[PDB]
Amino acid sequence: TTRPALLRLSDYLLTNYRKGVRPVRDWRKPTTVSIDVIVYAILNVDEKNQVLTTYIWYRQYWTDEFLQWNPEDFDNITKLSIPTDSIWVPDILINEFVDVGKSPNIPYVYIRHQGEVQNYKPLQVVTACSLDIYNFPFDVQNCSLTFTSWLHTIQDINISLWRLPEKVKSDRSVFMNQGEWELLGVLPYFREFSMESSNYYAEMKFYVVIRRRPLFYVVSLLLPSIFLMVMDIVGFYLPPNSGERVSFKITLLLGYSVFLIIVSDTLPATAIGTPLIGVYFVVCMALLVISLAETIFIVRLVHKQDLQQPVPAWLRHLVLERIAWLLCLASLAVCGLLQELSSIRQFLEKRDEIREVARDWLRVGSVLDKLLFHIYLLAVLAYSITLVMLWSIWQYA
Amino acid sequence: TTRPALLRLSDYLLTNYRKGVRPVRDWRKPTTVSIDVIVYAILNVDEKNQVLTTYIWYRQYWTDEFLQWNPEDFDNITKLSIPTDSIWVPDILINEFVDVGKSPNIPYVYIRHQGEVQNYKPLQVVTACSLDIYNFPFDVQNCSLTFTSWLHTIQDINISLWRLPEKVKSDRSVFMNQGEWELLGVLPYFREFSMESSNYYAEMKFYVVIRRRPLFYVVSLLLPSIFLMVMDIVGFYLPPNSGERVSFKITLLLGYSVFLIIVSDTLPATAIGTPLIGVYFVVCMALLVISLAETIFIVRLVHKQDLQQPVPAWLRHLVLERIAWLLCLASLAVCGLLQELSSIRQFLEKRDEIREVARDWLRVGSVLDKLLFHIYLLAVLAYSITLVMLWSIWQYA
Amino acid sequence: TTRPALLRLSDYLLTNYRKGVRPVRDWRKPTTVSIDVIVYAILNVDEKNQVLTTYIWYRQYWTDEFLQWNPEDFDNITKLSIPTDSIWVPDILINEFVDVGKSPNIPYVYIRHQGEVQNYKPLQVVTACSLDIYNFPFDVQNCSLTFTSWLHTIQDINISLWRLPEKVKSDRSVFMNQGEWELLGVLPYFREFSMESSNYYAEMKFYVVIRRRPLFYVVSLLLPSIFLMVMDIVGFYLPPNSGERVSFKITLLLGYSVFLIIVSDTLPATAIGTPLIGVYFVVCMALLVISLAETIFIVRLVHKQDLQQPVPAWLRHLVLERIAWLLCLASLAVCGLLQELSSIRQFLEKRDEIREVARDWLRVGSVLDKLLFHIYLLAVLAYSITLVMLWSIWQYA
Amino acid sequence: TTRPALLRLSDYLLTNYRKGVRPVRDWRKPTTVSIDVIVYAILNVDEKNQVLTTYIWYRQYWTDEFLQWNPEDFDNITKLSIPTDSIWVPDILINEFVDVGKSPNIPYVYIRHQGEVQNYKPLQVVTACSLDIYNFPFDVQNCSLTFTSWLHTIQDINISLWRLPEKVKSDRSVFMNQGEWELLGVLPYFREFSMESSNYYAEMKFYVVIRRRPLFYVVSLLLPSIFLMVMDIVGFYLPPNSGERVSFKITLLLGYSVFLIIVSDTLPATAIGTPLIGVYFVVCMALLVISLAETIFIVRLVHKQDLQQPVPAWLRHLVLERIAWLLCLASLAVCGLLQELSSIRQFLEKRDEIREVARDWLRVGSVLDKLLFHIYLLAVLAYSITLVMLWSIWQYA
Amino acid sequence: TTRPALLRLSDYLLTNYRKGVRPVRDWRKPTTVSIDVIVYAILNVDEKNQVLTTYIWYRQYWTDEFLQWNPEDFDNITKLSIPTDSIWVPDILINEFVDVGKSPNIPYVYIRHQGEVQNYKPLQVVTACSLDIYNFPFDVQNCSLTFTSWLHTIQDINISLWRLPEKVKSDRSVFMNQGEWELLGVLPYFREFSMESSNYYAEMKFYVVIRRRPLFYVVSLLLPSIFLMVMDIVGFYLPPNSGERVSFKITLLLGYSVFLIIVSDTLPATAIGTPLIGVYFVVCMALLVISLAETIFIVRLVHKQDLQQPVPAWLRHLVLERIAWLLCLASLAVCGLLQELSSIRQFLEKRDEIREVARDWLRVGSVLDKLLFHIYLLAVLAYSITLVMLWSIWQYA
Ligand SMILES: *[C@@H]1O[C@H](CO)[C@@H](O[C@@H]2O[C@H](CO)[C@@H](O)[C@H](O)[C@H]2NC(C)=O)[C@H](O)[C@H]1NC(C)=O
Ligand SMILES: *[C@@H]1O[C@H](CO)[C@@H](O[C@@H]2O[C@H](CO)[C@@H](O)[C@H](O)[C@H]2NC(C)=O)[C@H](O)[C@H]1NC(C)=O
């Protein structure tokens, strides 16, 4: 024939084709759409809004009973490319859609002589799923993509898998693995959904399992916390008499509060439940408050010298003997002169006695400060070891 | 017939069909559109802009008097799928629209032999409603969706419900319940709206009632507040003489002010009215200011020792007797020597008297500090109990 | 006739209709477009960018001389609905456009037998206007919407009002009154604009007058300011000798500076002129600086005791008499003993004299501190009363 | 003729017209497009991304040799409106495009009997240019708009100006002058651009010169700076012995650092070069650091009294004579008594000598503090005067 | 011929042309698309999301075997412009697409008599690549653009380069060089990609190498750091007895922590690895912590005077001899009088001895403070020199 083979075949196919008619000679035969999903990247995970944005390479093929031809009559053409906007295309969508992502339009599809139509197209899908951040930053999310025909029931359109389920499960060839999220697998699952008495719908659920990389968050959260805790430990060495100890502790607490406020404003959160990491921040705040309370108690005990109250005997024993051991620690004119110089005696006696009372109070305060510093340091060490053990469990288990 | 049944039926229907003509043989008969609304998710609630963004699964069916056929003449076809862009579609819109949401296009609709046309399509609707945050974070919003034909009057297009009102009221099958907002119900209501003398319009109002989950806000707001209040309580134990008490209190107040500024910058607000939660922040600020004023008063009273003024007798009685009980608390040369050593007497007398005056002032200040600390602690406890009772009322009522 | 009346009428009208031809039999006759504007909501007012975003319900009608028919020939059809995309539509736009808002498309328009065409459509219009914030937060903005035919001159398209000007002026039926902005009126005004010698253009200017609700801003700005001013007033009671007064004042000033920086970063501003509210912040900062300067002066005066300089007589009189009244306030060995004990006399004399000089300086400083505190309190009260009077004028005038 | 003149003319013109053919009878004749640009507003200037967003009223006219008619044959019609989407339109674009702005579509164009086609359309153009902020906030930007035919070479499409260059240069009729940027002029310039051997392209470059209004930035930057500098000046009056001077200075420096960090986070910047205004901030920081260093030096000099080191004679002379002038400032028992009371002599001697050494050190420190305060105040005054002179030069030159 | 040459040629070409058929007479012959890429600007580099946004001037040409004509039959027309939407266009896309950028549409393409079709069009491409910020701010990114036919295999569409690889490699004519990123080169590379047994795909990978300009980041990060380090150095001069040293150091540390938090919130970061610049911030924080620990140790050593413990002999030797050298530093009544005045002796003895013990402790503390200040200054100088050497290596290597 004079005309080119491709042109003649396209004229033979599309001159009598109806775009709005489902391609089945017998209307009782459903149109089976075999789909495949390849996850490319996790563009954004919005735990606040429970919205997942991901980019996939979606492809589907079905049988077009009207687009069939004999290759021998068209120069042995067995495969042909036809515009997408000139043939019937199933209305396969995702139930979890909450927004329309902007994706490039694929103008052509492949068609084979026996009727198979191959449609490859990438999709930016904005889907809402359950983003539980209880184990944040070690959370593993399980978001599902439910591909289903929005209108046509299973008696018209049914859905199946292009490849074997195992291959889809472990398909990670083109995934952007350098991002915050690691793709564990894509689990397919078929279900015949229904709400009406006979309106049964075909669904293919792809469970996109993604695991967060916690090292960035672990650093950005722990490092300031351990720095402030170390500074708190160092602050104990300041003598209680200097007075700068209270200012140091309160300034450190203010800095920690500012840091925690910033962290809360920056970290993700969900209204249904708070992450477990927030408990550790509360524990650190409690430790800092305990340190400041101990500092205030020691300061008050030292200033009790201003009470002019001799140290009780029982406290003396308890602190300086038990705890200290535990811590490994003209005659008439002359007689008038005598009487007055004894008044001087009595006044200097009183001043020296006040000084010695302050001495005793200060010694007791220092001993108790050493004891409480040791106790607080041991508690902090135990808490740090417990946290490290939890991290090791999450790391190696 | 040689041609496929679906192709022949589509040709028989759409070859003479006019897309821009309302499908009624008699123009006096209105076209009744039975709609249904299923709320899927509350994407965003903007109290600042009074804008609500939600995703719904909207579906409507009407009768197309031109798209009727006899099944026996088309291989017993009783249901057919036809492209949406090839048939008349009512211009049902929402009055509350302030923006166009991006929603996937459904290319096909279902058509039955007797003329019924079924159109399923999801809609991201950006609607403006009254978001009163007076009871924030326990606010229950009542936003209405008014589906109405923008142009056609009731003499042309009328609207009704697909399902019974009760089923629509309690339809929560696919709602995303893990979000910040909980769906209480969707109340439908029909109204024949009108502004002109004869331009009566059909309206179907769906009242989307959503309740906020307050636990997240409750925690994020109370926990810093109770932490700072506890720190304020601890600060009372600092002795007034140390001087660090004033610095502690002012630093705590500065931290609370910064926290409140951040909270205001982060919490939602409306220009028509402030939330009731802002009163509790003002109460906490007043409590902190009262604490600082008491600290300043005690500091001034203690420093009154620098006034060299003996304590008044009435104040002495009132504080050290009533309140304290309530709180369960060569001759000529020798005579010259005598005269001078008595001058020494008088100077040490004066110094000791000054010290004793300071003693009395300090004792009075300490007693009053204990009293005011007890009073402030009782007031704080009462306020906390009242707040807890209010929360319990909001929780169990 | 066998065919339906609506179908026959649509065929009779649109089969010979040209969409791109202005509908006038005589080209010398202009096409008069009667428009109407109903403001629905003020979505956003951007004082920084001088951009106004509002949602309106715009509707226009004109006469289509080609779309005329005799009702008696079409089953007494006097009103018909025709797709918008099948008839000529005027290119009415707003000159103030700076952006294209996304608005739902209305597919149908109403047509009557005598030629009138009714087009209802909502519009999200992003327009630039003069947003003067001089009276912020009590500013009343006056933004104009100039509807005009972009291309056609007045010899082709002319514009008029659908309703009477009074009704348009007071049309507030569907306005969202719960927002930050209150709609005072929509004033229409017609003008025959021109730039060329004969290119006269029809314009219809709608002056959208909106008034801001200041209560939210009034609270969010005054409450921190009055709180900090009250704290400054309380700080005067701290004795100058404690030394904590300077730290208190400087910390308060730092907090106020941080608050003012945040307020400036959050409040709207224009490069052409600053709001009058900024003057009051400067006044408050000046008051705080004056308070700190007075505190520093009193501290220096008290520490002048370290100068070992007796108080000048004139200052003594002025402060302790005038101002205080205003404020309602072996012989040789024995003689050697005598000589030395008189050396002791002289040393204790000097120490006591130094103490008394410090006494006098402290008394003078305290009296002057009381005076300056009274003066500053009176000035603050006067400023607050003036501000309250200004607010009352803005409220009741 | 029975048909309307406009309808008949449109049928005569557009029935044989090809939309995709350049309108020239002789293909060797280029199509000359006369353009005009009117700047309406400067929507956004992004110095960070080097992106300029502006709104212009662009209009162009060319000759359509196929759309010609004799007015006498069509009821003396000399001007006609035709849809834009039905005639050939040149592909004039801007080379500097980096984004597509959303602009309203103009559906109609004017056509005259001799072939001229007038196309008016507004354009929101997002263009990238060189935004040098070296003279910020007094920077004058010079951004170019290069209108050129993307595909057609000069042998097909050539570009010229609608109006005279002078009129375009001074066209400021509709510019929004209330914004941050002031339009100085729009300079046109034609160039025959080329890269290949014969692919010469016509370009029309419009140089949009815009000048920033600096008053807002000048205030928002200077006022905090001068306030903090004044506070630093006041801080010198605090006596060095009080100890609050160091806390005051360090708190002021912390506040200035926070302010500078916020300013840097808010002010625009470019990676190619920093603005000159940053030098003045560095100078202010250096001044504050010098003030704090002087305060620390004076504090150390005063505390040298704790060194028990008498003031060197040379320092005494230099400070208290030169600089001070510049600043305008039983026998055995009795002998035992004698020996011991002389031991008392020696101890009180030592205490008084220590006090006098502290006296001398304090006097020297006070004199040097006065000197350095005068020097620092003079330096600050000189810097402020220099800055004011620079501002006056930028204002009046 | 009467008709215009261009019109006649367009009619001859496009009247029988099929838009959806690949232009090859023999379907076995692949369509070779020669592409070219010119990078215009780097709009945005998102290290957080691993997304690159760039603007390129993409152009491709291929052979259209159906659009061929003899110039002599059409008035010697050798080149023609035809609308893009009227001819077959290959579906060349970028694999790395994650979003659709908005780019102007080019309506026309050039066609030559022998069949070559030239298509010029700009593209805003949003592509995901590996943005390693390990060497930040001196990082050199290597992002690839893989142009490939999405559907057609290599047996249908193959891709080649328009120009020589060297010219494409060094094409920087129109690049916006004033931005944050500098373009080093664009390296092309061809690959026959494949996943199936016979589905081989043609790919052309352009490696866009961009280098960041670090001067802005270098300044904005170092200048605050060096300022705070200098302030820390100055703080050592404060005497330990003043007590303001601890407050100064803790305030400086708080300021540095706030600065570091802001820097972290502003600087880019990746979850796969932290930048090396973060180590230097940790080193600076460690230096500040060491300085504060030294200050606390010196303060405690000085306050040890409150321990009433004479300085150990070994410490005395070590500090005041070795280190100091290294640093280049009636009888009965009279006898009663005697006994009591000797009691006075003993009390003043004790007071003076306490004073001398404090003297010794203070001298030791001052000497050790000088030593540790010298050591810390030397360490800081060494660290600064090492950092400067690293910068010089990065600058000149
Ligand atoms: C428009 O439709 C509504 C809903 O079907 C009609 O309202 C119903 O009218 C019937 C008959 O009068 C009543 O029995 C129902 O109780 C009504 N339902 C409701 C919810 O009001 C309405 O009459 C229709 N109007 C027109 C003009 O057709
Ligand atoms: C364009 O329309 C306006 C509005 O209808 C016309 O203005 C009116 O003109 C009539 C007759 O001259 C007056 O009686 C009215 O008072 C005018 N109204 C206003 C608001 O000005 C205007 O004349 C029309 N112009 C043309 C050229 O048709």
Distance separating alpha carbons of residues A309 and B4, to the nearest angstrom: 110
Q: If you search the block for the tokens 């060096």, which residue do you land on?
A: E226
Q: Which helix or strand (DSSP H or E) is residue C212 part of?
A: strand C200-212
Count of structural domains within chain D:
2
Nearest chain C residue to B157, by CA: C81
Burial class (CB within 10 angstroms; exposed 0-12, middle 13-18, buried 19+) of A96: buried
> What is the rounded radius of gyration, in angstroms, for the C-alpha atoms of chain A?
40
Question: Using CA atoms in the order D249, D254, D259, D264, what is the torsion angle rounded to 10 degrees?
Answer: 130
Q: Are E208 and E138 in contact (CB under 8 A)?
A: no
- Co-location of A161 and A25 in the same domain: yes
Q: Percent helix, strand and coil across chain A, each rounded to 5?
A: 45, 25, 30
Q: Are A188 and A163 in contact (CB under 8 A)?
A: no
Residues of D in contact with E255 (CB under 8 A): 254, 257-258
Query: According to the 3-state scheme, what is the secondary structure of D339-365?
Result: HHHHHHHHHHHHHHHHHHHHHHHHHHH
The terminus-to-terminus CA distance of chain B in angstroms comes to 71
Burial class (CB within 10 angstroms; exposed 0-12, middle 13-18, buried 19+) of D123: middle
Residues in CB range of A294: below 8 A, 6 or more apart:
A369, A372, A376
Main-chain dihedrals φ then ψ at residue A272, nearest 5 degrees: -85, -25
Strands C157-161, C31-36: pairing kind:
parallel
Q: Are E68 and E113 in contact (CB under 8 A)?
A: yes
Q: Which residues pair with A99 in a beta bridge?
A: A126
Closest ligand 1 atom number to CA of residue B190: 20
Residues of D in contact with E227 (CB under 8 A): 257, 285, 289
Question: Using CA atoms in the order A118, A121, A125, A129, what is the torsion angle rounded to 10 degrees?
Answer: 30
* HSE value, Cβ hemisphere, 13 Å, CA-based, for C384: 13
Residues in CB range of D37: below 8 A, 6 or more apart:
D56, D57, D58, D145, D147, D168, D186, D188, D206
Distance separating alpha carbons of residues A260 and A92, to the nearest angstrom: 46
Q: Are A236 and A371 in contact (CB under 8 A)?
A: no
Q: Which helix or strand (DSSP H or E) is residue C119 part of?
A: strand C116-128
Closest CA to E306 of B81, D12, A243, B249: A243
Distance separating alpha carbons of residues C59 and C123, to the nearest angstrom: 10
- Co-location of C383 and C367 in the same domain: yes
- Long-range CB contacts for residues C224-231, cutoff 8 Å, separation at least 24: C224/B257, C224/B261, C224/C259, C225/C280, C225/C281, C225/C284, C226/C384, C227/B257, C227/B285, C227/B289, C228/C252, C228/C255, C228/C256, C228/C259, C228/C284, C228/C288, C229/C284, C229/C287, C229/C288, C229/C380, C230/B289, C231/B253, C231/B289, C231/B292
Name chain A's partners: 3 or more CB pairs within 8 A: B, E
Q: Are A376 and A237 in contact (CB under 8 A)?
A: no
Instruction: Tell me how long chain B is.
Output: 397
Distance separating alpha carbons of residues A142 and A140, to the nearest angstrom: 7
Closest CA to C241 of B302, D231, E240, D362: B302
Distance separating alpha carbons of residues C53 and C101, to the nearest angstrom: 9
Neighbours of D329 (CB within 10 A): 11
- Co-location of D40 and D180 in the same domain: yes
Q: How far is A29 from chain E (nearest CA, A)?
A: 29
Task: State whether C246 and D238 contact (CB < 8 Å).
Answer: yes
Distance separating alpha carbons of residues B272 and E193, to the nearest angstrom: 62
Residues of C in contact with D83 (CB under 8 A): 19-20
Answer positive or negative: Cα dihedral of D198, D201, D202, D203.
negative
Q: If you search the block for the tokens 């600020």, which residue do you land on?
A: B285
Ligand located closest to C29 CA: 2
B16-51 CB burial, b ≥16 within 10 A, e <16: ebbebbbbbeebeebbebbbbbbbbbbbebebebbb
Q: Percent helix, strand and coil across chain C, each rounded to 5?
A: 45, 25, 30
Q: Which residues pair with D31 in a beta bridge?
A: D157
- Co-location of E208 and E225 in the same domain: no
Distance separating alpha carbons of residues E149 and E143, to the nearest angstrom: 20
Q: Which residues pair with B141 in a beta bridge?
A: B210
Biggest CA-to-CA distance, chain C? 159
Task: State whether B50 and C179 contact (CB < 8 Å).
Answer: yes
Helix, coil or strand: residue C304: helix
Last residue of a domain, one of E195, E213, E231: E213
Distance separating alpha carbons of residues A63 and A116, to the nearest angstrom: 4
Sheet-wide strand order for B200-212 = B92-94, B140-149, B200-212, B181-194
Distance separating alpha carbons of residues C278 and B209, to the nearest angstrom: 42
Q: What is the DSSP letter of C164?
A: -
Main-chain dihedrals φ then ψ at residue E57, nearest 5 degrees: -105, 90
Strands (E) across chain D are located at: 31-36, 39-46, 51-63, 79-83, 92-94, 97-100, 108-112, 116-128, 140-149, 157-161, 181-194, 200-212
Which residue type does D49 have? N
Q: Could you tell me how far CA C178 lies from the centroid of its own chain?
A: 17
Which residue type does B155 have? Q
- Co-location of C38 and C147 in the same domain: yes
Q: Are A381 and A337 in contact (CB under 8 A)?
A: no
- Co-location of E255 and E380 in the same domain: yes
Cis peptide bond N-terminal to A4, omega within 30: no
Strands (E) across A152-199 are located at: 157-161, 181-194
* HSE value, Cβ hemisphere, 13 Å, CA-based, for A97: 24
Closest ligand 2 atom number to CA of residue C155: 27
Calculate the alpha carbon distances from A388 to A222, C17, D373 in Å.
11, 81, 55
Last residue of a domain, one of B154, B184, B213: B213
Distance separating alpha carbons of residues E109 and D115, to the nearest angstrom: 25
Strands B157-161, B31-36: pairing kind:
parallel
- Co-location of A223 and A306 in the same domain: yes
Q: How far is the CA of B24 from the centre of ligand 1 (A)?
A: 19
Distance separating alpha carbons of residues E172 and E56, to the nearest angstrom: 12
Closest ligand 1 atom number to CA of residue B165: 20
Helix, coil or strand: residue B125: strand
Distance separating alpha carbons of residues E229 and E240, to the nearest angstrom: 19
- Co-location of E171 and E220 in the same domain: no
Q: If you search the block for the tokens 């001088």, which residue do you land on?
A: C50
Answer positive or negative: Cα dihedral of C178, C182, C185, C187.
negative
Here the tokens at position E313 are: 């002999």
Distance separating alpha carbons of residues A99 and D397, to the nearest angstrom: 56
Q: How far is the CA of B158 from the centre of ligand 1 (A)?
A: 9
* HSE value, Cβ hemisphere, 13 Å, CA-based, for C261: 24
The parent domain of residue E59 ranges over 5-213
Burial class (CB within 10 angstroms; exposed 0-12, middle 13-18, buried 19+) of B392: exposed
Which residue type does E204 have? M
Closest CA to D337 of A349, B332, C335: C335
Q: How far is the CA of C148 from the centre of ligand 2 (A)?
A: 15
Neighbours of D86 (CB within 10 A): 17
- Co-location of B254 and B287 in the same domain: yes
Q: How far is A237 from chain E (nearest CA, A)?
A: 7
Answer positive or negative: Cα dihedral of C270, C272, C275, C280.
positive
Here the tokens at position B29 are: 């008969």
Closest Cβ–Cβ partner in A246, A289, A340 for B238? A246
Calculate the alpha carbon distances from E305 to B19, C69, E295 in Å.
101, 113, 16
Here the tokens at position A32 are: 């089976």
Closest CA to B239 of A312, A299, C245, A243: A299
Distance separating alpha carbons of residues B184 and B187, to the nearest angstrom: 10
Q: What is the CATH number of the domain that holds A80?
A: 2.70.170.10
Atom 25, ligand 2: which residue's CA is nearest?
C158
- Co-location of D178 and D228 in the same domain: no
Nearest chain E residue to D331, by CA: E331
Task: State whether E178 and D130 contact (CB < 8 Å).
Answer: yes
Q: Output the ligand 2 site: residues, CB below 6 A.
A: C 30, 154, 158, 160, 190, 202
Residues in CB range of D146: below 8 A, 6 or more apart:
D94, D95, D96, D203, D204, D205, D206
Residues of A in contact with E89 (CB under 8 A): 107
Atom 16, ligand 1: which residue's CA is nearest?
B190
- Describe the crossing of helices C331-396 and C215-235 by its angle, rounded to 10 degrees: 170
Strands D200-212, E140-149: pairing kind:
unpaired
Nearest chain B residue to A299, by CA: B238
Cis peptide bond N-terminal to B104, omega within 30: no
Distance separating alpha carbons of residues B367 and B360, to the nearest angstrom: 11
Residues of B in contact with A89 (CB under 8 A): 107
Answer positive or negative: Cα dihedral of C175, C181, C184, C189.
negative
- Co-location of B104 and B184 in the same domain: yes
Quick check: is A1 in a domain?
no
In the A/E pair of chains, how many CB contacts fall below 8 A?
A: 183
Quick check: is A35 in a domain?
yes
Neighbours of E94 (CB within 10 A): 20
Neighbours of A28 (CB within 10 A): 11
Cis peptide bond N-terminal to B137, omega within 30: yes
Distance separating alpha carbons of residues B198 and B155, to the nearest angstrom: 10
Query: According to the 3-state scheme, what is the secondary structure of chain E?
Result: CCCCHHHHHHHHHHCCCCCCCCCCCCCCCCEEEEEECCEEEEEEEECCCCEEEEEEEEEEEEECCCCCCCHHHHCCCCEEEEEHHHCCCCCEEECCEEEECCCCCCCEEEEECCCEEEEEEEEEEEEECCCCCCCCCCCEEEEEEEEEECCCCCCCEEEEECCCHHHHHCCCCCCCCCCCEEEEEEEEEEEEEECCCCCEEEEEEEEEEEEECCHHHHHHHHHHHHHHHHHHHHHCCCCHHHCHHHHHHHHHHHHHHHHHHHHHHHCCCECCECCCHHHHHHHHHHHHHHHHHHHHHHHHHHHHHHHCCCCCHHHHHHHHHHHHHHCCCCHHHHHHHHHHHHHHHHHHHHHHHHHHHHHHHHHHHHHHHHHHHHHHHHHHHHHHHHHHHHHHHHHHC
Here the tokens at position D151 are: 């595909």
Question: Using CA atoms in the order D358, D361, D366, D367, what is the torsion angle rounded to 10 degrees?
Answer: 150
Last residue of a domain, one of D213, D229, D259: D213
Q: After which residues is chain E broken (C to N over 2.5 A)?
A: 329
Which residue type does D63 have? T
Neighbours of C196 (CB within 10 A): 8
Name chain C's partners: 3 or more CB pairs within 8 A: B, D
Resolution, rounded to a tenth of an Å? 3.0
Calculate the alpha carbon distances from E53 to A181, A281, C31, E97, E102 in Å.
21, 38, 48, 10, 11
Q: Are A277 and A264 in contact (CB under 8 A)?
A: no
Answer positive or negative: Cα dihedral of B292, B297, B299, B300.
positive
- Co-location of B197 and B247 in the same domain: no
Q: Output the ligand 1 site: residues, CB below 6 A.
A: B 30, 154, 158, 160, 190, 202
Here the tokens at position D316 are: 């005494």
Q: How far is B207 from chain C (nearest CA, A)?
A: 17
B163-195 CB burial, b ≥16 within 10 A, e <16: eeeeebbebeeebbebbbbbbbebebeeeeeee
Q: Are D344 and E344 in contact (CB under 8 A)?
A: yes
Closest CA to E144 of E57, E49, E52: E52
